[PDB]
Amino acid sequence: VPVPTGGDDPTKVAMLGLTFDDVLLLPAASDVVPATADTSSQLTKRIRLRVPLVSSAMDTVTESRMAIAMARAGGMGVLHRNLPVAEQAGQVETVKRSEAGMVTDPVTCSPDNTLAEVDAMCARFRISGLPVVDDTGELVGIITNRDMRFEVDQSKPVSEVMTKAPLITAKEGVSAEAALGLLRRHKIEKLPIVDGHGKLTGLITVKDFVKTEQFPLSTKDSDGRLLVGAAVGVGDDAWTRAMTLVDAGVDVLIVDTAHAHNRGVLDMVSRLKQAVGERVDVVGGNVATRAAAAALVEAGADAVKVGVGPGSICTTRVVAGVGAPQITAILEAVAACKPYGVPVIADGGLQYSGDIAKALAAGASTAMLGSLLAGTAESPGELIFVNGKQFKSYYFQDDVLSEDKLVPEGIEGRVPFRGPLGTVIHQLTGGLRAAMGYTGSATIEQLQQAQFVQITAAGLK
Amino acid sequence: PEGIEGRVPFRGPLGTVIHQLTGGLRAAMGYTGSATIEQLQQAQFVQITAAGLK
Amino acid sequence: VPVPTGGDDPTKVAMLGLTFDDVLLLPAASDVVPATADTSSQLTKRIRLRVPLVSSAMDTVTESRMAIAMARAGGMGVLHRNLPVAEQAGQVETVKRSEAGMVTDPVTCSPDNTLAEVDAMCARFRISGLPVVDDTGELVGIITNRDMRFEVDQSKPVSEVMTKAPLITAKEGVSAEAALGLLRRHKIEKLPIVDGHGKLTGLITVKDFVKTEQFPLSTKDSDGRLLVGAAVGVGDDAWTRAMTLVDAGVDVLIVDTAHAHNRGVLDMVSRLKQAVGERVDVVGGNVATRAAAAALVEAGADAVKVGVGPGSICTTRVVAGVGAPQITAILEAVAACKPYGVPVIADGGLQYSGDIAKALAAGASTAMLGSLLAGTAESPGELIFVNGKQFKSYYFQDDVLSEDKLVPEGIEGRVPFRGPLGTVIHQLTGGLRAAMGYTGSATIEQLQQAQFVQITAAGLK
Amino acid sequence: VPVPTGGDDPTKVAMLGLTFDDVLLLPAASDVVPATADTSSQLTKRIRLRVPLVSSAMDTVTESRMAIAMARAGGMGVLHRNLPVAEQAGQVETVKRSEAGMVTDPVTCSPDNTLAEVDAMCARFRISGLPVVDDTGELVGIITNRDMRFEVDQSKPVSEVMTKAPLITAKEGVSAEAALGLLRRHKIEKLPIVDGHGKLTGLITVKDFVKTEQFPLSTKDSDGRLLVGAAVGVGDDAWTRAMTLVDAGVDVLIVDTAHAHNRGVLDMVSRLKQAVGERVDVVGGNVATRAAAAALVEAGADAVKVGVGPGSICTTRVVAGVGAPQITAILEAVAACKPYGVPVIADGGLQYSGDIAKALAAGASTAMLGSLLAGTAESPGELIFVNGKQFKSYYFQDDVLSEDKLVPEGIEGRVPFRGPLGTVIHQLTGGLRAAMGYTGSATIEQLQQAQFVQITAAGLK
C-alpha cells in the first residue's frame, strides 16, 4: 500500500525528470557525412528554416539587427515586446524592408524639396536613392547618392540636381534576368518599374541581387523579404499590439507567457487564429506537460513552445519551487503535438551545441537561443571597454508569473561580448552536423528518432 | 561540543522577508492552479536527478 | 656640480613630500586629560566650530540632511553644486529653516483654505501647524496637527476647524524664559508673536527649546539657525548661483576648483569678497603650494583649502602625473596663511582619525571629510539590501581639471553602508582627544605646535 | 630657508625613527662561545636577573603561575592589575610562598580540628602537611598526607590521627647541612624548627632543597623566596593597592601608564619612592623620549620602561596618530638614564629573539615580553580544542590613554596555544647567546656597546 518515497498516493511524484546532462546520443549505423547532412526543419506548419535556430524575444537578444542577421543565416528572430507598440511595429517594418525582389512602394520625393530634406529622408529610411515624382505623379527623374555628394549647396531643389527623364526604366512584369541585364548594360544601380501609363510602380536594385548571392540561406517569403516574428502578451492591449504588428507585415506572432496552461492564453491563441490565421502563424507560449501542449493544439496553435523553469539554478525553481526538466518536458509535449503535425520549439536550458542536438533528438523541431546570443555583435547594446574586457551596455513586462516578478529589484547589466553572430551559428551548426553524422541521420526528421543512453552522476565528474 | 556560538548576521526588517516568502508562495499557487492552500496540498511533484542540481 | 638625481638644475626636484603614513606625533609633557581637551577651532576668520570637521561638497556626501546632522554635531556641511541653482538654494533654505530661536517668517494659511491645501502646505514645508490671517492682516486663529487629525472630511474650511482668537500670544521682545513659561502654563506647543497692533510677526515653539537642549554643540548664527556652506564654480553661471545662495541665507561660499592657482579663481574670490563679504565668508579652492596659498590670501580668502592629488592611487596622480603629498602641502600652505590669520582646511587623503590629528598638527585648522562619510545614513541615497550586504543606492560639473574629466565614461554607485553619522564623529573625535592627551595640547592651537617623528618603510610593514 | 620636507621650522620633524627591522648587528672580533656567554643583567638598581627577560603585566600573560615559572627560569613576572586589590595581593602571596629556605609562618592546626578542616586548609594553602599546636602553643604533633590518606573517617579529630610528640625537630638557626642530614637520617619530609622554649618557629622541607637543585637559576631574595613584581596606576585607589601589595611582600612596584610624561605619574613615583623606597623598587611607566626619561629619573625611579606605540600597526598609531619607533626611543632614553645608572626596560614591538638582541644592543638592560608568552601553558586561561587546533580560552583600567579606550567594543579571546614556557625562553636565550657570540660580547654590558648597520627596504624583501 505505501509508496517507497512516502505516503499512500503513487501519483504524488508523477515522473522522474531528465535534463540535458542526464542523457547522451548513442552512435548508430551511418552513411551520413557531416557536411552533407540536411539541417532544415519546420518552425511552424507552413514555415521551414534552413537552420533550426530562432533567437529569443528578450530585450537583450533580438531587435531588428538581430532579426535581420538571423534571417540571413537561415533562422529567424523574434522581436521582444518590452517596448511601445509603435516602436515594435517600426522594428518589424525595418526587418521586412531590408531586402526584396522588387521594392513595391519605393520612397519618392518632389522636385521642390531641398537636398537637406532628401538627406533627412535618406537617414530616416536608411537608403540612398529616390525617384522623383511631381504633383501629377509622373516620373520626372531620379536623385541618388552620386548627385548629392558632389553638391555643396544643401538648399538647392531636386530639379537642379536630379537626373531628368528619359530614364532607364522597365515595364511591370519584367523578368529578373532582363532587369539585371538592363542594369548591367547601362552601368546603373537602380531601375524603376512603371505601368502602362508611365506612372511609377516599383524599384529594382543591383544590391538585392548581390545580397541574394551573399546570403543563399536566407529565410524569405514569396516576395523575397526576410521573415520575422514578434511576441505579444494577453489582454486587450496585446490585441491592439498584435493587430498593429500584423499590419506592419509580421510573419509569426508568438503568444509569449510564462505559463500558457491558462484560459486567457488559450482564448488569445484561438482569437488570433480566427482573426489573422490566414496570413500569420500563431505560436503558443511555454508549456511543460502533455496536457498543456494538448490544450494549445486544441486552441489551434501552429507551434508549441516548451520550457518552464528549465535551468538548474533557475529563479523559477528557487523562488517558486516550480520547474520541469527539459528532456522529459520535450518528450511529453511531443507526445501530444506530433500526431497533429504541430512542431515543437525547445526554449531554455541550452548551454552547448550538444544540447541542441539532444533537444532535436528528443523530438523538438527547433531550438530557441537566449543567453548564447546575448553578447554577440548583432544583439542590442553598445560595445564598451572596461578594465581591458569588452562588454555590451544598455510599463511593459505584464506577465504576472514572469521571472522579473520573482527576482528582487536591483541592477543587472554589462553582459559580456561574444563576437559576431555568424561564428556562433557556425559552431552550433557544426556540432549539430557532427551529431547527425554519428547517429546516421540524413535529416532532422531522422534525428528525431535517435536513441539516448542515460548516464549516472559519475559520468558528470 | 562545548564552545562559543554568536554574531548572527543582520538581515533587515521582518516585513521584507515575509513579503518575499509570500510572493514566492503566490507564484507557486499561480503556476499550479491552486486558489487556496487546501488545493496546493493536492499538487504533484516531479523528481529530478543529480544533474538537476549542478 | 651635477645633482645626484640627475641633471644640473638643483631645483628640478623641488622637495621631498611627506604623506600621512610617513610621520607620527611624538608624545610630549602633558597634563591634558582626553575628556577635557578643547577641540574647538576656526573654520574661517569669523566662524569657530566646536568640532573641527566639515563634510565635503560631493553629491554622495552632503545634502540638506547631512548638513543638518553635521551642524548639530558641532561641525558644518558644504552642499554640493552638481544640481540646478534653484535646487541648491532650496537645500540651503531647508537647512536654515530647520530650527531657530524664533521662526521669524512663519507659514500662514487663510480662513478659506481647505484641509487638503493646509495638508499640502505642511508637506511642502515639513511643519504641522499654521497661524491664520485674513485679508486685513489680522491674526484670527491657529490650526495645528491635532485639529487636522480628527477631521475625516478634507474639504472642510479652516475657519470650521481652527482654534479661534483670542489665542495665547506674546508681544515682541519677549524673553525666552517668559515664552517657555507661557507655553508650559497653557500646555501648548506654539506661541504666536504679534506687534503692538496684533499683526503676526513670529512664532516660538517648544520643539526649538527641546532641540537646543538636545544638541548643545550645534553650529548656529545669532538667530539660532544652523550654519551652512555651499560650493560655487567659476564663470557667469557661478556668479548667478552665488548671488542666489547668498539670498537664500548661506553662511560660507567655497570657490571649489581642482586648481585654484588660476587668475579666474582669484578674480572670482575677489569679486565675491567685495560684493557679499560683509555677510558671508569666502573660502578659496584647493591649493598645494606656498605660492598658491599666498595668492589666495592676497585675493582676500577667509580660509584656504589644501589638497591636489593627495591620495596615493589618486586618479590625478595616475592619469595626469600631478600631485602633492598632503603633510608637506599643509606645511607649505600654513607657512603662507598663518602670518595673516587665515585658517587652513585639509582636504583629501584622510583614512583614519590619526590622520586627522596629524593634519591638525601640521598646521591645519579644520579637516574636510569625504569618503569616510559617504556611506552613513545621513548622506544622500536610499538604503537597500544586495546579497546580504547593505548598500546605498542613488550640464553641471564644469571644472575643466576635475577627476571626472580624467576617469573614463563608466558606471559608479552602490557605496557600502556605514551606519549613523554620530558614531563616526564620536570615533574620530575620540582619536583626536587621545592625540591631544598624548601631545599635551589643551587646545587645537597648541596641537598645531606638536612635533613629528619620521618613520621608514619598515615601520609600515 | 625652507625645510626640504616643508615649512620654515627645521624642528617640526624632530628625528628619523628606526624600528627593529631597520638595523642589524655587525659582527665584531670575538672569542666568546655562546654556551659560556653570561646573560645576566640588572632589572633595577638593586635586582640582577640571570635571564634579562620579564613577562608583561597583562591579564592574558602574567598571573601567579606565570610569575613563578618566570622567576624559576631566571627572569621575573609582573602581575597585572586588572582585578580587585585583594586578589592581586593574594597572587603576590601565592608567588612569595611557593618556596623558601625555611617556611617562617607555617600553617598549623589544633588537636580538635577534624580531618575535613585540615583538608580544607591544605587546599586553601596548596600544601599537604601541618604541625599541630594546642591552646598553650606547645607543638603537640604533626599531621601530614600519609596519616590522612589511610583514614576513611573524615569526621575524626587530629589528635587521634596525628604523629604525637616527641617529634624530630631542630633549634633556631640550624645550618642547611645539619637540617638536611637530620631530614635524611629519619626518612621524613618535614623538620619543625623550635626556639629555646620549644615553641614552634619554622619548618624546613626536603622539597625546598629539591626545588633549589631543580631550578638553579631562580630569582630569589635573601630568604630564598621567589621575586615578583606588580603594577599600579595613579590615584588614591592606586595608593591603597600599592600599600596592600607592599604588605603582601611584593619586590617591585611598576607605575604602569601609557604616557608617563605626566605630573600625576611622576608625583606617584616620588610618593612611592619616599614611603616604601627602602624596601621595594619603583619602576616608571612607558616613555619614548629623552626628556620623559630624564623626568622619571629625577622623580626617583629605579628603572625606566620604554615604548609608546612601538608596533607598526599599533592601535595608538592608527587611532591617535602617536608613536615612536623603538630603536630610536631606546637610544634616546638610554642617553638620559645611563649617566645615572638607571636601567632601561624595553616594552613592546618584539617579535623574534633577534629583536631582543637588538634592543639590548641599543642600550636597554631588560626586555618585557608580551604577546610572545600569551599562548604558553603557564599563561592564564583554560586549554581547549577547537577544530583540531588548540586555543586558550578566558571597574579597573583607569588609564585614560590606554588602547582599550581606543578600540571599539567587540569580541577578543581564544589566544592560540604555544606550548611550555621553558621552550620559548630557551629559544630566546639561544638567539641572544648567538648574538653575543657574533658581536664578541662576554656580558650584557659589553653587548650594550655593539654597533648597528642600517638596512634599506630591499633588505626586507
Ligand SMILES: Nc1nc2c(ncn2[C@@H]2O[C@H](COP(=O)(O)OP(=O)(O)OP(=O)(O)O)[C@@H](O)[C@H]2O)c(=O)[nH]1
Ligand atoms: N532605394 C531604395 N532601396 C530600398 C527601399 N526600400 C528598401 N530598399 C532596399 O535597400 C537596398 C538599396 O539601398 P540603397 O542605399 O539605395 O543602395 P544602392 O545605392 O542601390 O547600392 P550600393 O551603392 O551598393 O549601396 C536594397 O536592398 C533595397 O531592396 C526604397 O524605398 N528605396
Ligand SMILES: Nc1nc2c(ncn2[C@@H]2O[C@H](COP(=O)(O)OP(=O)(O)OP(=O)(O)O)[C@@H](O)[C@H]2O)c(=O)[nH]1
Ligand atoms: N510651525 C512652524 N515651525 C517652523 C516653521 N519654520 C520652521 N519651523 C521649525 O519647525 C519646528 C516646529 O515644527 P512642528 O512640527 O510644527 O512643531 P510642533 O508641532 O511644536 O512639534 P512636535 O513636538 O513634533 O509636536 C521648530 O523647530 C520650528 O523652529 C514654520 O513656518 N512653522
Ligand SMILES: Nc1nc2c(ncn2[C@@H]2O[C@H](COP(=O)(O)OP(=O)(O)OP(=O)(O)O)[C@@H](O)[C@H]2O)c(=O)[nH]1
Ligand atoms: N608544609 C608547608 N610547606 C609550605 C608552607 N608554605 C609554603 N610551603 C612550601 O610548600 C612546599 C612543601 O609542600 P608540601 O606539600 O607540604 O610538601 P611535601 O609533602 O614535603 O613534598 P612532596 O611529598 O615531595 O610533594 C615547600 O616548597 C615549602 O617551602 C607551609 O605552611 N607548610
Ligand SMILES: Nc1ncnc2c1ncn2[C@@H]1O[C@H](COP(=O)(O)OP(=O)(O)OP(=O)(O)O)[C@@H](O)[C@H]1O
Ligand atoms: N535608372 C536610372 N536612369 C538614369 N540615370 C540613373 C538611373 N539610376 C541612377 N542614375 C544616375 O546614375 C548615376 C549613378 O547612380 P547609381 O544609382 O548607379 O549609383 P549611386 O547610388 O548614385 O552611386 P554610389 O552608390 O556609388 O554612391 C547618378 O547620377 C544617378 O542619378
Ligand SMILES: Nc1ncnc2c1ncn2[C@@H]1O[C@H](COP(=O)(O)OP(=O)(O)OP(=O)(O)O)[C@@H](O)[C@H]1O
Ligand atoms: N497659542 C495657541 N493658542 C491657542 N490654542 C492653541 C495654541 N497653540 C496650539 N493651540 C491648539 O491647541 C491644540 C493642541 O495643539 P498643539 O500645537 O499643542 O499640538 P499639535 O501639534 O496639534 O499636536 P501633537 O504635537 O500632540 O501631535 C490644537 O487644537 C491647537 O489648535
Ligand SMILES: Nc1ncnc2c1ncn2[C@@H]1O[C@H](COP(=O)(O)OP(=O)(O)OP(=O)(O)O)[C@@H](O)[C@H]1O
Ligand atoms: N618531623 C617529623 N617527626 C616525626 N614524624 C614525622 C615528621 N614529619 C612527618 N612525620 C610523619 O612521618 C610520616 C611520613 O610523612 P612525610 O612527611 O615523610 O610524607 P607525607 O607528605 O606524609 O607523604 P608523601 O609520601 O605522600 O609525600 C607521616 O606519618 C608523618 O606524620
Ligand SMILES: [Mg+2]
Ligand atoms: Mg549607392
Ligand SMILES: [Mg+2]
Ligand atoms: Mg555602390
Ligand SMILES: [Mg+2]
Ligand atoms: Mg505637534
Ligand SMILES: [Mg+2]
Ligand atoms: Mg507634539
Ligand SMILES: [Mg+2]
Ligand atoms: Mg609529601
Ligand SMILES: [Mg+2]
Ligand atoms: Mg611525597
